Amino acid sequence: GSELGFNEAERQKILDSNSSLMGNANEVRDKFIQNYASSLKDSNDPQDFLRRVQELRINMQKNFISFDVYYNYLNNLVLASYNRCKQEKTFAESTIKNELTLGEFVAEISDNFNNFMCDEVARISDLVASYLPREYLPPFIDGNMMGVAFQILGIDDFGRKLNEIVQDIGTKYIILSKNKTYLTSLERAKLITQLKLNLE
Amino acid sequence: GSELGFNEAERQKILDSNSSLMGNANEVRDKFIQNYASSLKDSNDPQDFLRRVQELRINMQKNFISFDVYYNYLNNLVLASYNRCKQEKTFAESTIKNELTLGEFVAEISDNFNNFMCDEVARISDLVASYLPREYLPPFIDGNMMGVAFQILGIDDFGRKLNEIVQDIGTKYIILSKNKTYLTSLERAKLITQLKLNLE
Amino acid sequence: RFNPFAYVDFGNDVVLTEDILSQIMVASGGDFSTQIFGLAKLVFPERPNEKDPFFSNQARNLFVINCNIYRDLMWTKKGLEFVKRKKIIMPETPTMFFIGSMASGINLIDEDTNMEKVVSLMEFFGGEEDKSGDNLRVLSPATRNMWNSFKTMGGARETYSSVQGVYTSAFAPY
Amino acid sequence: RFNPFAYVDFGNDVVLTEDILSQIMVASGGDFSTQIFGLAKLVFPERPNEKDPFFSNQARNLFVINCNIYRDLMWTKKGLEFVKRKKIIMPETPTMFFIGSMASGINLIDEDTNMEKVVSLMEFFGGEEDKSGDNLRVLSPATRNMWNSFKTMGGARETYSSVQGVYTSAFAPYN
């Protein structure tokens, strides 16, 4: 079982193989936001703010900034991650005869799949949300300007796409882990008894 | 610009940079179909054919065959192709002030984007549809068995995803080509007159 | 008096860029690709409960294909020259009735009898009636792409008439 | 008497494999992730010509977050020990009324006054009532992931109340 557990070397291979797509997204975001977004603070009024946000969106495009590459990158990661973990799990199931040892490998493979994917999703999601930079918001900023600004910048749409990836990661993790994080109904009924919880 | 026109080398780099996912896909298909699908021809009734199709689906997954990988590959291609062609087009528009020369470069870039993407989509689409192998249908195959089999094998669902990719390619080609393939209303009314077409 | 195709942009009449398109029964969209896939989903909605989603999916594809065939023949120079030469009969503005009728194929004046006939898409575009390949070549790359996929899926020998049946029934109100 | 959560599989009762899953107001799906995002779409449908889609998209995310918080607290061993320890009040089977009520936060017994109180999610999970960080750590990776995304978007200071309003609106049939 030397090479199993979706270890750091295997996770680094997948990150390396998709590293080109990202470039230095953080550097690109920081350079872009410094150059094009500061004027948002001086918006004369609500209408003017939204107008400046649309201009910021047009400037993102002119700078080849699109969240489509970030969504593809995450899709690439889930597929390669799931593929490797599924190979490791099935290989472990065919070769490991110690049933407790097998369960430990299954838990480690699936845990590392789950945390690998969730951490990259969080990193990409934070990057995307930061294209509405809070330090440059105007002092009269309210919730409806913020919402519409999220829509204009494509951040709202990216958030919807995240639902699909998160749901997909969730199903794949449920498969890889055989759901062992969560109790059976009988195990749960017994723990509620032992814990002396009175529910409802 | 000696490097403009989305040339063979630029297309080849995108193919090379993405062919890791599509390693020997045609050979994977041919060996899988050879080794697992031939018994479809000996199906005994429509309901037995569909149960064998469901087993074929199960064996696809056991053999790590997933159309999700092919859909990701096409998304990777569209985004890399569009990025490169957008880079070339914007460069040509800022450096080539002869309108005739520029229009020729714009048409070549966008034509090559369109044919490159359409050719790859057709290659993937044919591959996916070939997982319902013609050489092995039972002699009583009808349209309803065929339709359900396309659904069971994931081929129908892939066809739906192709709608999204084809639409995206279409919009991107309209942007890259400036729609110059198609006539203006006035040019069209003129050509209809000149051709003495009497329509309706 | 309403015709959804009156609001579909078939030609090159408005400047369409990234800038303009990102700000952007009648389908939404600024470009023909977006508009026509949107209209196809209005004509062939997705119903979650399925009695043959494949046939309905493939009929929606055939709708997009027919609309693209109309655009390629009637809104390009080489298309309109081809329509003149082959004596193809198509309207100046498409209607739901006309697009519905394309299920049967291309209306043209026969070369020998000089009478109007209909040639199926399968024969006319890349088939028995197109052995020089001249007809298929007039179509754009996207139209040829979708037609290739369709012949491989809904256009298969066993499924075709059932797809045409599902297609035709959405045009009954015309 | 109909409860859609009665048809959501919170626990580990069904054998779920790729093979089984390939064959597949109640949401369809054989696994918790599919079912809960499906149910979120029934409660917060995607309206075609909807005004401000951001608030409803983020209210829909909040629904998924609240349901995952319930599952992590009530359907894991360490979650149930945390619920006992913290004197958190949650039902044995969630209801639409209860999930709507999580918009205000976590119901628990105040240790000082021994009276029931509500602590906002923002304070309770990673917030000022969780400087320890232990509350956030009892949640699963997906729940923390979604909760992180939410705080950068719908839960931002300007929009949170609007999102909560849209969220609570969907539960008007139940209050």
Short mmCIF file of N, CA and C in Angstrom, two decimals, chain B residues 2-133:
data_model
loop_
_atom_site.label_atom_id
_atom_site.label_comp_id
_atom_site.label_asym_id
_atom_site.label_seq_id
_atom_site.Cartn_x
_atom_site.Cartn_y
_atom_site.Cartn_z
N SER B 2 3.54 37.48 -39.35
CA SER B 2 3.92 36.19 -39.90
C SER B 2 3.40 35.01 -39.07
N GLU B 3 2.87 35.28 -37.88
CA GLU B 3 2.35 34.26 -36.99
C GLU B 3 0.83 34.35 -36.82
N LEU B 4 0.16 35.17 -37.63
CA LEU B 4 -1.28 35.36 -37.58
C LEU B 4 -1.99 34.34 -38.47
N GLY B 5 -3.27 34.13 -38.19
CA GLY B 5 -4.08 33.23 -38.98
C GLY B 5 -4.38 31.89 -38.35
N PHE B 6 -4.26 31.77 -37.02
CA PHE B 6 -4.47 30.51 -36.28
C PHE B 6 -3.96 29.33 -37.09
N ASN B 7 -2.64 29.26 -37.28
CA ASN B 7 -2.05 28.35 -38.24
C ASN B 7 -1.93 26.94 -37.66
N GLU B 8 -1.45 26.01 -38.50
CA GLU B 8 -1.34 24.61 -38.09
C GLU B 8 -0.55 24.44 -36.81
N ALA B 9 0.56 25.16 -36.68
CA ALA B 9 1.39 25.00 -35.49
C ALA B 9 0.66 25.46 -34.24
N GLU B 10 -0.09 26.57 -34.33
CA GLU B 10 -0.82 27.03 -33.16
C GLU B 10 -1.93 26.05 -32.79
N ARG B 11 -2.66 25.55 -33.79
CA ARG B 11 -3.66 24.53 -33.52
C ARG B 11 -3.03 23.27 -32.95
N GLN B 12 -1.88 22.86 -33.51
CA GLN B 12 -1.21 21.65 -33.04
C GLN B 12 -0.78 21.79 -31.58
N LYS B 13 -0.31 22.97 -31.18
CA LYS B 13 0.07 23.15 -29.78
C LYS B 13 -1.11 22.95 -28.86
N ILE B 14 -2.30 23.41 -29.27
CA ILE B 14 -3.49 23.24 -28.43
C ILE B 14 -3.89 21.77 -28.38
N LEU B 15 -3.85 21.09 -29.52
CA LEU B 15 -4.04 19.64 -29.54
C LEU B 15 -3.04 18.93 -28.64
N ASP B 16 -1.75 19.26 -28.77
CA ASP B 16 -0.72 18.60 -27.97
C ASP B 16 -0.94 18.87 -26.49
N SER B 17 -1.26 20.11 -26.13
CA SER B 17 -1.41 20.45 -24.72
C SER B 17 -2.64 19.81 -24.08
N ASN B 18 -3.55 19.22 -24.86
CA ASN B 18 -4.78 18.68 -24.32
C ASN B 18 -4.96 17.20 -24.63
N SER B 19 -4.03 16.59 -25.36
CA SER B 19 -4.20 15.21 -25.76
C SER B 19 -3.96 14.22 -24.63
N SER B 20 -3.58 14.68 -23.44
CA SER B 20 -3.40 13.74 -22.33
C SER B 20 -4.73 13.08 -21.97
N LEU B 21 -5.81 13.86 -21.98
CA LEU B 21 -7.14 13.33 -21.67
C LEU B 21 -7.61 12.34 -22.74
N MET B 22 -7.34 12.64 -24.00
CA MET B 22 -7.79 11.84 -25.14
C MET B 22 -6.73 10.87 -25.64
N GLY B 23 -5.92 10.33 -24.74
CA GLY B 23 -5.01 9.28 -25.14
C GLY B 23 -5.77 8.11 -25.74
N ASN B 24 -5.27 7.64 -26.88
CA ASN B 24 -5.76 6.48 -27.63
C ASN B 24 -7.26 6.19 -27.47
N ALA B 25 -8.09 7.24 -27.58
CA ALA B 25 -9.52 7.09 -27.36
C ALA B 25 -10.15 6.13 -28.36
N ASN B 26 -9.71 6.16 -29.62
CA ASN B 26 -10.29 5.27 -30.62
C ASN B 26 -9.93 3.82 -30.34
N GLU B 27 -8.70 3.59 -29.87
CA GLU B 27 -8.28 2.24 -29.52
C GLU B 27 -8.99 1.76 -28.26
N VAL B 28 -9.16 2.65 -27.27
CA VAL B 28 -9.95 2.29 -26.09
C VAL B 28 -11.36 1.88 -26.51
N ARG B 29 -11.97 2.65 -27.40
CA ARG B 29 -13.32 2.30 -27.84
C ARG B 29 -13.32 0.96 -28.56
N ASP B 30 -12.38 0.77 -29.51
CA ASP B 30 -12.41 -0.45 -30.32
C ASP B 30 -12.17 -1.69 -29.46
N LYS B 31 -11.23 -1.62 -28.52
CA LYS B 31 -10.99 -2.79 -27.67
C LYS B 31 -12.18 -3.04 -26.74
N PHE B 32 -12.76 -1.98 -26.17
CA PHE B 32 -13.89 -2.15 -25.27
C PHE B 32 -15.07 -2.77 -26.00
N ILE B 33 -15.40 -2.23 -27.18
CA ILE B 33 -16.53 -2.74 -27.95
C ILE B 33 -16.28 -4.17 -28.38
N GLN B 34 -15.06 -4.45 -28.85
CA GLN B 34 -14.70 -5.82 -29.21
C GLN B 34 -14.90 -6.77 -28.03
N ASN B 35 -14.40 -6.39 -26.86
CA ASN B 35 -14.37 -7.32 -25.73
C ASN B 35 -15.67 -7.38 -24.96
N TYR B 36 -16.59 -6.43 -25.13
CA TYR B 36 -17.76 -6.38 -24.25
C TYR B 36 -19.11 -6.27 -24.95
N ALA B 37 -19.18 -5.85 -26.21
CA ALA B 37 -20.46 -5.50 -26.80
C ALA B 37 -21.00 -6.53 -27.78
N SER B 38 -20.18 -7.51 -28.18
CA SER B 38 -20.58 -8.42 -29.26
C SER B 38 -21.80 -9.24 -28.88
N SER B 39 -21.96 -9.54 -27.59
CA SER B 39 -23.13 -10.30 -27.16
C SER B 39 -24.44 -9.56 -27.36
N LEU B 40 -24.41 -8.26 -27.71
CA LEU B 40 -25.66 -7.56 -27.97
C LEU B 40 -26.40 -8.18 -29.15
N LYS B 41 -25.66 -8.71 -30.13
CA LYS B 41 -26.26 -9.27 -31.33
C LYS B 41 -27.08 -10.52 -31.03
N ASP B 42 -26.71 -11.27 -29.98
CA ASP B 42 -27.46 -12.44 -29.54
C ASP B 42 -28.54 -12.11 -28.52
N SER B 43 -29.00 -10.86 -28.46
CA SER B 43 -30.08 -10.54 -27.54
C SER B 43 -31.33 -11.31 -27.96
N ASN B 44 -32.11 -11.74 -26.98
CA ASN B 44 -33.22 -12.64 -27.29
C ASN B 44 -34.56 -11.93 -27.44
N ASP B 45 -34.78 -10.84 -26.74
CA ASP B 45 -35.97 -10.00 -26.97
C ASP B 45 -35.57 -8.56 -26.68
N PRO B 46 -36.45 -7.60 -27.03
CA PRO B 46 -36.13 -6.20 -26.71
C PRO B 46 -35.75 -5.96 -25.26
N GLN B 47 -36.46 -6.60 -24.32
CA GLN B 47 -36.13 -6.38 -22.92
C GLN B 47 -34.78 -6.99 -22.56
N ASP B 48 -34.40 -8.10 -23.22
CA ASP B 48 -33.07 -8.67 -22.98
C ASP B 48 -31.97 -7.81 -23.59
N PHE B 49 -32.25 -7.19 -24.73
CA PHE B 49 -31.30 -6.28 -25.34
C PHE B 49 -30.99 -5.10 -24.41
N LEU B 50 -32.03 -4.52 -23.81
CA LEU B 50 -31.83 -3.36 -22.95
C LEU B 50 -31.11 -3.74 -21.66
N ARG B 51 -31.39 -4.92 -21.11
CA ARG B 51 -30.63 -5.36 -19.95
C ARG B 51 -29.16 -5.56 -20.30
N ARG B 52 -28.87 -6.12 -21.48
CA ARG B 52 -27.48 -6.21 -21.89
C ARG B 52 -26.86 -4.83 -22.14
N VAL B 53 -27.65 -3.86 -22.59
CA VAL B 53 -27.12 -2.51 -22.77
C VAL B 53 -26.76 -1.90 -21.42
N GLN B 54 -27.63 -2.10 -20.42
CA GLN B 54 -27.33 -1.65 -19.07
C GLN B 54 -26.05 -2.29 -18.54
N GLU B 55 -25.84 -3.59 -18.82
CA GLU B 55 -24.59 -4.24 -18.41
C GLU B 55 -23.40 -3.65 -19.15
N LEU B 56 -23.59 -3.34 -20.44
CA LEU B 56 -22.53 -2.67 -21.19
C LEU B 56 -22.16 -1.34 -20.54
N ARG B 57 -23.17 -0.57 -20.12
CA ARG B 57 -22.93 0.67 -19.39
C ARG B 57 -22.11 0.41 -18.12
N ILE B 58 -22.50 -0.61 -17.35
CA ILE B 58 -21.76 -0.91 -16.13
C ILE B 58 -20.31 -1.22 -16.45
N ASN B 59 -20.08 -2.01 -17.50
CA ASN B 59 -18.71 -2.36 -17.84
C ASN B 59 -17.92 -1.16 -18.34
N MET B 60 -18.59 -0.21 -19.01
CA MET B 60 -17.95 1.05 -19.39
C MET B 60 -17.33 1.73 -18.18
N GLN B 61 -18.13 1.91 -17.13
CA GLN B 61 -17.64 2.53 -15.90
C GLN B 61 -16.52 1.71 -15.28
N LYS B 62 -16.66 0.38 -15.26
CA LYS B 62 -15.61 -0.47 -14.69
C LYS B 62 -14.31 -0.32 -15.46
N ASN B 63 -14.40 -0.01 -16.75
CA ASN B 63 -13.24 0.18 -17.60
C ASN B 63 -12.81 1.64 -17.67
N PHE B 64 -13.31 2.48 -16.75
CA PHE B 64 -12.93 3.89 -16.64
C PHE B 64 -13.25 4.68 -17.91
N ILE B 65 -14.34 4.35 -18.59
CA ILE B 65 -14.75 5.08 -19.78
C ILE B 65 -15.81 6.07 -19.35
N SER B 66 -15.57 7.35 -19.62
CA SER B 66 -16.46 8.41 -19.18
C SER B 66 -16.55 9.48 -20.26
N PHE B 67 -17.77 9.79 -20.70
CA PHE B 67 -17.90 10.85 -21.69
C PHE B 67 -17.63 12.22 -21.07
N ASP B 68 -17.66 12.31 -19.73
CA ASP B 68 -17.31 13.57 -19.07
C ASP B 68 -15.91 14.03 -19.47
N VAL B 69 -14.99 13.09 -19.66
CA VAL B 69 -13.64 13.44 -20.07
C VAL B 69 -13.65 14.05 -21.47
N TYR B 70 -14.51 13.53 -22.34
CA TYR B 70 -14.54 14.04 -23.71
C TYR B 70 -15.17 15.41 -23.76
N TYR B 71 -16.17 15.64 -22.91
CA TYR B 71 -16.81 16.95 -22.86
C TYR B 71 -15.84 18.00 -22.31
N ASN B 72 -15.08 17.65 -21.25
CA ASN B 72 -14.05 18.54 -20.71
C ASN B 72 -13.01 18.88 -21.75
N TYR B 73 -12.60 17.89 -22.53
CA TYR B 73 -11.59 18.10 -23.56
C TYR B 73 -12.05 19.16 -24.56
N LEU B 74 -13.31 19.05 -25.00
CA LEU B 74 -13.85 20.00 -25.96
C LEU B 74 -13.93 21.40 -25.35
N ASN B 75 -14.31 21.50 -24.07
CA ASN B 75 -14.33 22.80 -23.40
C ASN B 75 -12.93 23.39 -23.31
N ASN B 76 -11.93 22.55 -23.00
CA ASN B 76 -10.54 22.99 -22.98
C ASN B 76 -10.13 23.54 -24.35
N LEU B 77 -10.49 22.81 -25.42
CA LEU B 77 -10.14 23.23 -26.77
C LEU B 77 -10.77 24.56 -27.12
N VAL B 78 -12.08 24.71 -26.87
CA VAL B 78 -12.78 25.93 -27.27
C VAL B 78 -12.13 27.13 -26.61
N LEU B 79 -11.80 27.01 -25.32
CA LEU B 79 -11.29 28.15 -24.58
C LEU B 79 -9.88 28.51 -25.02
N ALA B 80 -9.02 27.51 -25.22
CA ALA B 80 -7.66 27.79 -25.69
C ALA B 80 -7.66 28.36 -27.11
N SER B 81 -8.48 27.77 -28.00
CA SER B 81 -8.61 28.25 -29.39
C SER B 81 -9.14 29.68 -29.43
N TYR B 82 -10.22 29.94 -28.70
CA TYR B 82 -10.79 31.27 -28.72
C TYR B 82 -9.79 32.29 -28.18
N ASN B 83 -9.08 31.93 -27.10
CA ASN B 83 -8.08 32.83 -26.52
C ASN B 83 -7.01 33.20 -27.54
N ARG B 84 -6.46 32.19 -28.23
CA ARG B 84 -5.40 32.45 -29.19
C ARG B 84 -5.90 33.28 -30.36
N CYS B 85 -7.09 32.93 -30.89
CA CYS B 85 -7.65 33.68 -32.01
C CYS B 85 -8.02 35.10 -31.60
N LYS B 86 -8.56 35.28 -30.39
CA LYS B 86 -8.82 36.63 -29.91
C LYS B 86 -7.53 37.44 -29.80
N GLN B 87 -6.46 36.80 -29.31
CA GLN B 87 -5.16 37.48 -29.24
C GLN B 87 -4.68 37.89 -30.63
N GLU B 88 -4.77 36.98 -31.60
CA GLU B 88 -4.35 37.29 -32.96
C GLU B 88 -5.21 38.37 -33.59
N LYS B 89 -6.53 38.27 -33.42
CA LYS B 89 -7.41 39.25 -34.04
C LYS B 89 -7.17 40.64 -33.48
N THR B 90 -7.07 40.77 -32.15
CA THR B 90 -6.89 42.10 -31.58
C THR B 90 -5.54 42.67 -31.97
N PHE B 91 -4.51 41.83 -32.04
CA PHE B 91 -3.21 42.28 -32.52
C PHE B 91 -3.29 42.76 -33.97
N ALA B 92 -3.97 41.99 -34.84
CA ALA B 92 -4.09 42.40 -36.23
C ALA B 92 -4.88 43.70 -36.36
N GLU B 93 -5.91 43.88 -35.52
CA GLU B 93 -6.73 45.07 -35.64
C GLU B 93 -5.98 46.33 -35.22
N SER B 94 -4.99 46.19 -34.34
CA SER B 94 -4.24 47.34 -33.87
C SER B 94 -3.01 47.63 -34.73
N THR B 95 -2.56 46.67 -35.55
CA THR B 95 -1.34 46.82 -36.33
C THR B 95 -1.55 46.85 -37.85
N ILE B 96 -2.67 46.38 -38.37
CA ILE B 96 -2.86 46.27 -39.81
C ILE B 96 -3.91 47.31 -40.20
N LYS B 97 -3.46 48.43 -40.75
CA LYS B 97 -4.36 49.52 -41.08
C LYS B 97 -4.94 49.43 -42.49
N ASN B 98 -4.36 48.62 -43.38
CA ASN B 98 -5.03 48.31 -44.64
C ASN B 98 -6.26 47.43 -44.38
N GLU B 99 -7.46 47.97 -44.64
CA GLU B 99 -8.69 47.25 -44.29
C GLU B 99 -8.80 45.93 -45.04
N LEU B 100 -8.36 45.89 -46.30
CA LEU B 100 -8.43 44.65 -47.08
C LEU B 100 -7.58 43.57 -46.46
N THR B 101 -6.31 43.88 -46.19
CA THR B 101 -5.42 42.92 -45.55
C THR B 101 -5.98 42.45 -44.22
N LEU B 102 -6.49 43.39 -43.42
CA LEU B 102 -7.01 43.03 -42.11
C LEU B 102 -8.19 42.08 -42.24
N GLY B 103 -9.13 42.39 -43.14
CA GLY B 103 -10.29 41.52 -43.34
C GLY B 103 -9.91 40.11 -43.76
N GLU B 104 -8.84 39.96 -44.55
CA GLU B 104 -8.37 38.64 -44.93
C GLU B 104 -7.82 37.89 -43.73
N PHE B 105 -7.06 38.58 -42.87
CA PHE B 105 -6.55 37.91 -41.68
C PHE B 105 -7.69 37.54 -40.74
N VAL B 106 -8.67 38.43 -40.58
CA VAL B 106 -9.80 38.18 -39.69
C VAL B 106 -10.60 36.97 -40.17
N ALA B 107 -10.78 36.85 -41.49
CA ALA B 107 -11.51 35.72 -42.05
C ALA B 107 -10.73 34.41 -41.90
N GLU B 108 -9.41 34.45 -42.08
CA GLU B 108 -8.61 33.24 -41.94
C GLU B 108 -8.57 32.78 -40.49
N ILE B 109 -8.34 33.71 -39.56
CA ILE B 109 -8.34 33.37 -38.14
C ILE B 109 -9.66 32.73 -37.74
N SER B 110 -10.77 33.37 -38.11
CA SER B 110 -12.06 32.90 -37.65
C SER B 110 -12.47 31.62 -38.38
N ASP B 111 -12.18 31.52 -39.68
CA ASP B 111 -12.43 30.27 -40.40
C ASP B 111 -11.68 29.11 -39.77
N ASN B 112 -10.41 29.34 -39.43
CA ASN B 112 -9.61 28.27 -38.86
C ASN B 112 -10.10 27.90 -37.46
N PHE B 113 -10.52 28.89 -36.67
CA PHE B 113 -11.17 28.58 -35.40
C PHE B 113 -12.40 27.70 -35.64
N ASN B 114 -13.23 28.08 -36.60
CA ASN B 114 -14.51 27.41 -36.82
C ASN B 114 -14.29 25.96 -37.27
N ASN B 115 -13.42 25.76 -38.25
CA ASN B 115 -13.17 24.42 -38.76
C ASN B 115 -12.41 23.56 -37.74
N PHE B 116 -11.46 24.15 -37.02
CA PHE B 116 -10.74 23.40 -36.00
C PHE B 116 -11.71 22.87 -34.93
N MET B 117 -12.55 23.76 -34.40
CA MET B 117 -13.49 23.35 -33.35
C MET B 117 -14.54 22.37 -33.89
N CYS B 118 -15.12 22.68 -35.05
CA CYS B 118 -16.14 21.80 -35.62
C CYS B 118 -15.57 20.41 -35.94
N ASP B 119 -14.35 20.34 -36.51
CA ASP B 119 -13.74 19.03 -36.79
C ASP B 119 -13.54 18.23 -35.52
N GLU B 120 -13.07 18.87 -34.44
CA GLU B 120 -12.84 18.13 -33.21
C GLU B 120 -14.15 17.70 -32.57
N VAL B 121 -15.17 18.56 -32.62
CA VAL B 121 -16.47 18.18 -32.08
C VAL B 121 -16.99 16.95 -32.81
N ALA B 122 -16.89 16.95 -34.14
CA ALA B 122 -17.40 15.82 -34.91
C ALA B 122 -16.62 14.54 -34.59
N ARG B 123 -15.30 14.65 -34.39
CA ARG B 123 -14.53 13.47 -34.02
C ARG B 123 -14.99 12.89 -32.69
N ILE B 124 -15.17 13.76 -31.68
CA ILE B 124 -15.65 13.31 -30.37
C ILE B 124 -17.08 12.79 -30.48
N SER B 125 -17.94 13.51 -31.19
CA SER B 125 -19.34 13.10 -31.30
C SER B 125 -19.45 11.71 -31.93
N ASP B 126 -18.74 11.48 -33.04
CA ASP B 126 -18.73 10.16 -33.67
C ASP B 126 -18.25 9.08 -32.71
N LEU B 127 -17.19 9.38 -31.95
CA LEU B 127 -16.64 8.40 -31.01
C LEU B 127 -17.68 8.02 -29.97
N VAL B 128 -18.35 9.02 -29.39
CA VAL B 128 -19.34 8.75 -28.36
C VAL B 128 -20.50 7.94 -28.93
N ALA B 129 -20.98 8.33 -30.10
CA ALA B 129 -22.12 7.62 -30.67
C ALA B 129 -21.76 6.20 -31.07
N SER B 130 -20.50 5.94 -31.39
CA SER B 130 -20.06 4.59 -31.73
C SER B 130 -20.05 3.64 -30.54
N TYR B 131 -20.30 4.10 -29.31
CA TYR B 131 -20.41 3.16 -28.20
C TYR B 131 -21.75 2.43 -28.19
N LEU B 132 -22.64 2.75 -29.12
CA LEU B 132 -23.78 1.90 -29.45
C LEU B 132 -23.42 1.30 -30.79
N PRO B 133 -22.74 0.15 -30.82
CA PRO B 133 -22.04 -0.26 -32.05
C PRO B 133 -22.99 -0.90 -33.05
#
